[PDB]
Structure formats: structure tokens, C-alpha cells
Amino acid sequence: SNRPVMGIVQDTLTAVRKFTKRDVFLERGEVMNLLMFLSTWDGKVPQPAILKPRPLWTGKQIFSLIIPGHINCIRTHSTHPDDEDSGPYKHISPGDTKVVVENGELIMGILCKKSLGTSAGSLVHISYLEMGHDITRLFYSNIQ
């Protein structure tokens, strides 16, 4: 069915859905502890999404660090409303329900089955088709 057979399952899928919510913020200790588990990390701590009143990184920053290469992808979260694309807030999502991976960076949206699961056009599929099987293996392991 010209689609991936391996996907993100169970704990990792529920946890990434929680993680890439708009309102997840990580203190620097948490960020460094998580970047320990990133095999493909280049050793450069990214700039925080919020510098003041305190340094904080969002979940999407760390996940953008996970995403390999410079892939580009557009999906919709499972709870994406059926009229948000027709409203004024089209490219800016009130619910953060439009996944836009851009230049290898997740810049908006919540990941779910329909972004990391086994389906045509899913992010792991595009990671395969662009970066090859080896980098997609590392992508899977790094997510988990």
C-alpha cells in the first residue's frame, strides 16, 4: 500500500501528542537531559523559544531537533476542525491543529497517528523517501 509499516505506537504516540502541544515548556535541565538521548544531535543547544523572564524551550523545538535533514510536510491533527481552513485563522491555528514541518523543523501543530503513524504522506514516510532508510531508522529510535 506504498506506505510505512512501522510507526510510532502506544506510549510514544500518546506522549508525543502531549509533547508537541503548544503549551509544553521545558527548563534547561530537562532540555539537556532529553538531548542526552538524541543520537543524531550535533551538540549545539538551540536558542530557547522564550529567553526572558526565564529561559524555556518548547516541545516543538526539541522535536524539530529530532526531525532529520530538511524535510517539509503538511498534515492535520485528528481534531482539526473542518472549517479552520475556511476561516480567517487559516495559517495561524487557534487549536494548533495544522502540522507544518518546515525545512526539517516542526514550526506548528500537534503530532498524532495522522503525522507519525502508518499512512501515506505521514512524516516517517517523507523521512524515508527523502533521507533514506538509515536516517529514518535513527529518526524512529530518537523519537522513542
Binding site: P48, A49, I50, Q61
Partner: peptide
């Protein structure tokens, strides 16, 4: 449109 780590 600007995206500060997800905050739009």
C-alpha cells in the same frame, strides 16, 4: 506570521 517555538 512568526512561530516562536510553536507560539504563533
Amino acid at each position: 506570521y512568526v512561530s516562536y517555538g510553536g507560539l504563533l
